[PDB]
Design a protein around this ligand. Structure first.
Ligand code: HEM
Ligand code: HEM
Ligand code: 0T3
Ligand code: 0T3
Lengths: 470, 465
């Protein structure tokens, strides 16, 4: 006795009122708070009167599980129009982020061994580790200059450059000295273009191209300029590795995009496509969780001390083999789960479902956009007693951690992001105390990704008073 | 056995695509055509989705009849928000065109006697007649200066200036010097302001102020600025007459607005709002049909003769007694009806219906906005056999509800008789002196900017007979 779809509670909003609001305010920064309010009012599930087709909103781990079982051989998420529009506009391919069906599987099966797999991690992680080391050392050099052995800064810029750097090293095998040196104009341009892309994504996202073409011509013009810039940044990288490997096939490991070029299992343009997604994808999605993690430790000193204690003890064996940072810092790994529980950069998981299923005892038809809202999911008091508490212990005691998604589609950059975040935190922790007066909740803001709206003024205080030694 | 509301056919599109359409287009110039191929395609009645509120579009006399039968004691047209908002902005009252309820009735009842009465019509018809005599007289001077004894021009300018001159005389007893001379900057400003006011109205009309406010704030600047020019024109007129009456009450007839001022049944403020409506309302609505009529006569020389023959035959007693023109030119009175059938100035009739009723075996809830759509109505080839035929004879036996281009009930156009007199009188004098021709045989594209209007001025030749 399952309830018919038509009998599911309904988000009260006109698709058109949202759209005009996006037109007026040039964005939709509270999306997540609204959604959250909506589950709060209506409960675990609801449907949204969309532009015609059925779409449903869920927030329970149970629902993710079922969603995973219904994953075909080709799971589907929605065609993000403005992004694809650009690719077809310049005649490019699309990486796994923008693909569906046979083309997606083909690519993903050829990217898993070299981006995601555990044998890939083990080659690229010591490279990340070196970048992570330079971050702290450089931050320590600046810290010890100060009479008080501390520095108080907005760490956002430098975190964003750490991830431009750690990533570009792992990906391409070049250091672009953006750690312990000022931003370049090339890196500042890139960052800005990525911001413009997301903002202009949100403006064009909520309406068909046929209509947005004539009511927002210059949003489109903005979006393509931003991409043109993101693409110039990423094609410059491609050109350099590509010419280099034309003349010398290395004996040793020189990064992820080198494996893909060597192994030649993918066409040049298919590699170009997937390189871009990795260069663009590796920056913001990693930086905000680091930032938010830095904030949570800063304002939970007792948890900070615990994570340090663990990192101080594993110090010696991690500088011996940096690869042991995965298995030896499980509290730190847990802290990340916790940061992403509260601050889920990917706001929601998306499936355009290909077979009737049952969620929450309602019946879901073939082609329903099911959408899993990870903000409300993370804050469910029933599943996460005291959700407002940052308590990484919570995780040590299943589908509760799913911020990278699930199944075969699960984030290709998961382990790179994980390594990058984990390793930076490890070195910061053994070297510095992290502090703030700014102990009130940071207001998160939606522009395609869920990001902090402000940056807290953080303090890094040296524990030792030495440049190398913790 | 009565089908309930939502059983009715549904206009394809939505208010939102409409808004945005209008935003980018800056207009809705095809509304009449768009509504027409909706009647063609869906039937003689349909609903339009306002997402909650209730609208019905109808095209048949049969239905108009029932609409009237359900006029209240206070028949309602909808609040025309932009126009009313201007009255709020500047602190003036509303006239009869924008009122509803007891305030409407109180105004209208004190308005008909001097604006619409047959008795009124006798007092001002000879004034109108003077101006239309000056029109042909002037046209004739120019025509005879030419070797072929004819002049080919675009008359739209001089026609508009005619209706300004004739309204001003009828309304204020004042005679501007516009007929047979040059447009003054005031009149030109005035015609511009009016046409911008219509333009801007369409741009704000189809969305609530809560949207137009931020979507189209320049269009609001544009709308009010147009009205400021319109209120400057009429208030100048009011001011003049107010002063002359404070000083001397005349023993004789000197205009419509004088009779209102001398009676003082209505308040000064109320007299002002109505006088303004009559001044703005007596220009584009009269002038466009009068042009369309000239075009159709040029297009149908054999209808032009019949009419010319009637006017020459009635010339003498009309010259001697102007007032008789209402009764001695029945074919010319029919031609007006004919023009208004094919070219209805006010595109739709309108009632926010007070009681329940049934139209076309559909149930229509109280509070519903029922619109009659006259362009379709008059083009109903099943009701007017050979509908694109200009045939004045069509109207020689009057049933009534085939001719509703001024509306119906207590609400029917207050300016109706002044309108008909002006158009009647001009054509009469033009017919006795000139033949009217064009090579332009092809239909003229109507355009919708709040009123339905030609989008082109056909080039006309006038030849002295
Ligand atoms: C903590 C940071 C990150 C989070 C929270 C995250 C999360 C996600 C999520 C939720 C999805 C959708 C998964 C699904 O539909 O099952 C996804 C897809 C994807 N992400 Fe990430 N990601 C992160 C970092 C990265 C990085 C650094 C990269 C690139 C180096 C990356 C590249 C991708 C790609 C290529 C896809 C498409 C995968 C596919 O469709 O197979 N992500 N990610
Ligand atoms: C060919 C000439 C005209 C046409 C086709 C026309 C059309 C109309 C229509 C269709 C209505 C609506 C009545 C209703 O909804 O029941 C109306 C009302 C009105 N008209 Fe005209 N009109 C014309 C000339 C004029 C003139 C010259 C004036 C000014 C002297 C004028 C002033 C008004 C006013 C004040 C109303 C409001 C009546 C009320 O609600 O009581 N009209 N007209
Ligand atoms: N091209 C491209 C591209 C740019 C940014 C991303 C980021 C931002 C969107 C959500 C997400 C999950 N994993 C990575 N990402 C992903 C792809
Ligand atoms: N104020 C004013 C005002 C200005 C123009 C008009 C015109 C044009 C709109 C429909 C109509 C019916 N009778 C006259 N009119 C009516 C009122």
């Amino acid at each position: 006795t399952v309830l018919p779809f038509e009998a599911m509670p309904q988000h009260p909003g006109n698709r058109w009122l949202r759209l005009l609001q996006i037109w007026r305010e040039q964005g939709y920064e509270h999306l997540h708070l609204e959604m959250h309010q909506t589950f709060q009012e209506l409960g675990p599930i609801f449907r949204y009167n969309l532009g015609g087709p059925r779409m449903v909103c869920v927030m329970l781990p149970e629902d993710v599980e079922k969603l995973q079982q219904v994953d075909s051989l080709h799971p589907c998420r929605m065609i993000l129009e403005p992004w694809v529009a650009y690719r077809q506009h310049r005649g490019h391919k699309c990486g796994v982020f923008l693909l569906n069906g046979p083309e997606w599987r083909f690519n993903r099966l050829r990217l898993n061994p070299d981006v995601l797999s555990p044998k890939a991690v083990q080659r690229f992680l010591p490279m990340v580790d070196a970048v992570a080391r330079d971050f702290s050392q450089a931050l320590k050099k600046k810290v010890l200059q100060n009479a008080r052995g501390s520095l108080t800064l907005d760490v956002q810029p430098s975190i964003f450059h750490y991830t431009i750097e750690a990533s570009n090293l792992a990906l391409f095998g070049e250091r672009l000295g953006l750690v312990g040196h000022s931003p370049s104009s090339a890196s500042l341009n890139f960052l800005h273009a990525l911001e413009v892309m997301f903002k202009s994504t949100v403006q064009l996202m909520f309406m068909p191209r046929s209509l947005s073409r004539w009511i927002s011509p210059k949003v489109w013009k903005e979006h393509f300029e931003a991409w043109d810039c993101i693409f110039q940044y990423g094609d410059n990288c491609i050109q350099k590795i590509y010419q280099e490997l034309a003349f010398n096939r290395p004996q040793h490991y020189t990064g992820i995009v080198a494996e893909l070029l060597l192994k030649a299992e993918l066409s040049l343009e298919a590699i170009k496509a997937n390189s871009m997604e990795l260069t663009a994808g590796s920056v913001d999605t990693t930086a905000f969780p680091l930032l938010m993690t830095l904030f949570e430790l800063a304002r939970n000193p007792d948890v900070q001390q615990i994570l340090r204690q663990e990192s101080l003890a594993a110090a010696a064996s991690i500088s011996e083999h940096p690869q042991k940072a995965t298995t030896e810092l499980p509290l730190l790994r847990a802290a990340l789960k916790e940061t992403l529980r509260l601050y889920p950069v990917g706001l929601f998981l998306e499936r355009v479902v290909s077979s009737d299923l049952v969620l929450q005892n309602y019946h879901i038809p073939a082609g329903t956009l099911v959408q899993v809202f990870l903000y409300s999911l993370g804050r469910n008091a029933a599943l996460f007693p005291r959700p407002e508490r940052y308590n990484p212990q919570r995780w040590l005691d299943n589908f509760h951690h799913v911020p990278f998604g699930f199944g075969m589609r699960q984030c290709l950059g998961r382990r790179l992001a994980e390594a990058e975040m984990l390793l930076l935190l490890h070195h910061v922790l053994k070297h510095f105390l992290v502090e703030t007066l700014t102990q009130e909740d940071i207001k998160m803001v939606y522009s395609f990704i869920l990001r902090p709206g402000t940056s807290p003024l953080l303090t890094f205080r040296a524990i030792n008073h030495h440049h190398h030694h913790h």
